[PDB]
Design a protein around this ligand. Structure first.
Ligand SMILES: Cc1cc2nc3c(=O)[nH]c(=O)nc-3n(C[C@H](O)[C@H](O)[C@H](O)COP(=O)(O)OP(=O)(O)OC[C@H]3O[C@@H](n4cnc5c(N)ncnc54)[C@H](O)[C@@H]3O)c2cc1C
Ligand SMILES: NC(=O)c1ccc[n+]([C@@H]2O[C@H](COP(=O)([O-])OP(=O)(O)OC[C@H]3O[C@@H](n4cnc5c(N)ncnc54)[C@H](OP(=O)(O)O)[C@@H]3O)[C@@H](O)[C@H]2O)c1
Length: 532
């Protein structure tokens, strides 16, 4: 399916972001087209097909709200939707609004350069397509370029090698195998108990332990769903008016004001309920080290109590960093897993990995022989997908160079020197710090509204004002630095790609507050942009 030679707006990516941009620009009466590397729609939910892949936000929150018909018709089945169900949802949306007619699959954007003479992007692909677009929307994701761990010998490994972010499209059979998983973030935590059910022996190679709390998944009562439907739009505006984009209770107390007994009774209640709302149990968990630590110890002790062998249990306890500052994980039978005969925790802080071998993995203490190795080693987050494209602005400035010390943006939406270019739910904005469907919807609507505004007013050039970008970047940093988030090496800071600048990339002030700023900006005719 050939892309058009010219279009008002070209969109890279057919995940949640790109698909809604396509939908909305069509409704705004703009020509629009999508380029996507994958063979079909879904983004993250197309690529991450590993067993156990699942929502970490409730199904009823992690969904599109732009269409009443979609909200009324779709029936979610569990508290936390599995990947295949999310993928059926996305397919349902794409079918309903005939989206694929606007998408070129199997195609990768390789370069894009702005032409000051015409105020347009020329965009090239790996199939040799050249498309000329007035506006360019990068809906290319946050967690979309898989990162391999940095160990030698990977290509010498004789067995089968997988990354969770590029999982095969037909079921992988691990029956009777000695299997290793490297990585114990959300992907490792989700996949490992699934593999443990097939493998003769599973070895989990943990570096820093992450905090995880129980999901307590359950079926969704159909009468609950039917009630919610009667007030769904209302329910969703409630979620938009929050820092996190969900119904999470914002606990008004300080974790330091309470007694040890009240702290325990309160956290015990969250622990039994399950899910991520414990993050907001007390207002200062992500702001005060001593407040954080009280919560952290409570979680650490629950972890100790889950695993019988206390030497194994202790190796699972997170240390060295504040609770909640690497993204919180929901676990289903992951801690319980290590009580099984056939599951072994390899502590690689104690015994670092030296090399992959043809037979398996060598640490400083011994060699582990394996038939398959699964990398749950994450992603080159936030900037990874952009940096794979040769994006050039005014004066032939490469985006990758301009951002070599960290992403530099105004509201996260655009960067000075690169006009008519917009980034969806990326650095400098709430992004993954909120329910991403709320982050995504707000960005798509703001961008596509801004674009409609340009056409309406016969303007053809939109650019962020350098001084406002610099002030935004400093603001992002200053507000991050009032939290505990910069204290820790996470993907939010880039600290998991060797050599990437260690800088907290996201806006921490909350979705609601961010959206307010955005609306004030557009209300004043896009203050901090120069439009011509
Ligand atoms: C396994 C996993 C689970 C998650 N679970 C949740 C959750 O429960 N709750 C939540 O809020 N968020 C979660 N997310 C975060 C997630 O990033 C968002 O919720 C959302 O799916 C992102 O959508 P998007 O369309 O912005 O990007 P993506 O879904 O990443 O889609 C981007 C698309 O752009 C394509 N692309 C990139 N570069 C190019 C190029 N150069 N040429 C052509 N195509 C390109 C990619 O192939 C991809 O298909 C999870 C993420 C992962 C990785
Ligand atoms: N909704 C869900 O439940 C769900 C599921 C999967 C992913 N996600 C999303 O995607 C994000 C990424 O999750 P993820 O688990 O894929 O990635 P991750 O959070 O970045 O975790 C990567 C893991 O691989 C390990 N690792 C990386 N490099 C390594 C190396 N060189 N040697 C040894 N270990 C190495 C890290 O150890 P260190 O911690 O020691 O670096 C960590 O355990 C999540 O935070 C979340 O936003 C969500």
């Amino acid at each position: 399916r050939q892309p058009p030679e010219e279009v008002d707006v070209l969109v890279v990516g057919a995940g949640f972001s790109g698909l809604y941009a396509l939908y909305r620009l069509r409704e705004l009466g703009r020509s629009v087209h999508v380029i996507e590397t994958a063979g079909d729609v879904g983004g993250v939910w197309y690529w991450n097909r590993y067993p156990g892949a699942r929502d970490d936000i409730e199904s009823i929150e992690y969904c599109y709200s732009f269409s009443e018909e979609v909200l009324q018709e779709w029936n979610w089945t569990e508290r936390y939707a599995s990947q295949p169900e999310i993928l059926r949802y996305i397919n349902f949306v794409a079918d309903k609004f005939d989206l694929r007619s606007g998408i070129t699959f199997h195609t990768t954007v390789t370069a894009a350069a702005f032409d000051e003479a015409t105020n347009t992007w020329t965009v090239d692909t790996n199939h040799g397509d050249r498309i000329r677009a007035r506006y360019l929307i990068m809906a290319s994701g946050q967690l979309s370029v898989p990162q391999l761990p940095n160990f030698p010998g990977l290509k010498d490994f004789a067995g089968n090698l997988y990354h969770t972010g590029n999982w095969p499209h037909e079921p992988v059979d691990f029956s009777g195998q000695r299997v290793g998983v490297i990585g114990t973030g959300s992907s490792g935590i989700q996949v490992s108990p699934q593999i443990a059910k097939q493998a003769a022996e599973l070895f989990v190679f943990q570096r820093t332990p992450h905090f995880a709390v129980p999901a307590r998944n359950a079926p969704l009562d159909p009468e609950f769903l039917a009630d919610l439907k009667k007030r769904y739009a209302e329910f969703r505006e409630e979620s938009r008016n929050t820092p996190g984009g969900t119904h999470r209770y914002q606990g008004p107390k300080s974790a330091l004001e309470v007694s040890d007994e009240e702290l325990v009774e309160t956290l015990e209640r969250y622990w039994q309920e399950g899910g991520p709302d414990i993050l907001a149990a007390y207002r200062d968990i992500l702001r005060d080290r001593d407040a954080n630590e009280r919560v952290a110890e409570f979680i650490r002790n629950k972890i100790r109590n889950t695993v019988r062998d206390p030497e194994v249990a202790e190796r699972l306890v997170p240390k060295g960093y504040p609770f909640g500052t690497k993204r919180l994980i929901l676990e289903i039978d992951y801690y319980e897993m290590f009580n099984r005969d056939n599951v072994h925790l390899v502590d690689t802080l104690s015994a670092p990995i030296e090399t992959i071998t043809p037979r398996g993995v060598r640490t400083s203490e011994r060699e582990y022989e394996l038939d398959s190795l699964v990398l749950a080693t994450g992603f080159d987050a936030l900037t990874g997908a952009l940096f794979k494209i040769d994006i050039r602005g005014v004066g032939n400035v490469a985006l990758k160079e301009k951002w070599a010390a960290g992403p530099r943006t105004y509201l996260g939406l655009s960067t000075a020197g690169f006009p008519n270019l917009f980034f969806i739910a990326g650095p400098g904005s709430p992004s993954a710090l909120s329910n991403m469907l709320v982050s995504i919807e707000q960005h798509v609507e703001w961008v596509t509204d801004h674009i409609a505004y340009m056409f309406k007013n016969g303007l053809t050039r939109s650019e962020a004002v350098l001084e406002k970008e610099d002030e935004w970047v400093e603001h992002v940093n200053e507000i991050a630095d009032e939290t505990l988030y910069p204290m820790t090496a996470s993907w939010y800071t880039g600290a998991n790609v060797p050599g990437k600048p260690r800088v907290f990339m996201l806006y921490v002030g909350g979705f609601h507050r961010y959206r307010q700023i955005c609306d004030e900006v557009a209300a004043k005719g896009y203050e901090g942009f120069v439009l011509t």
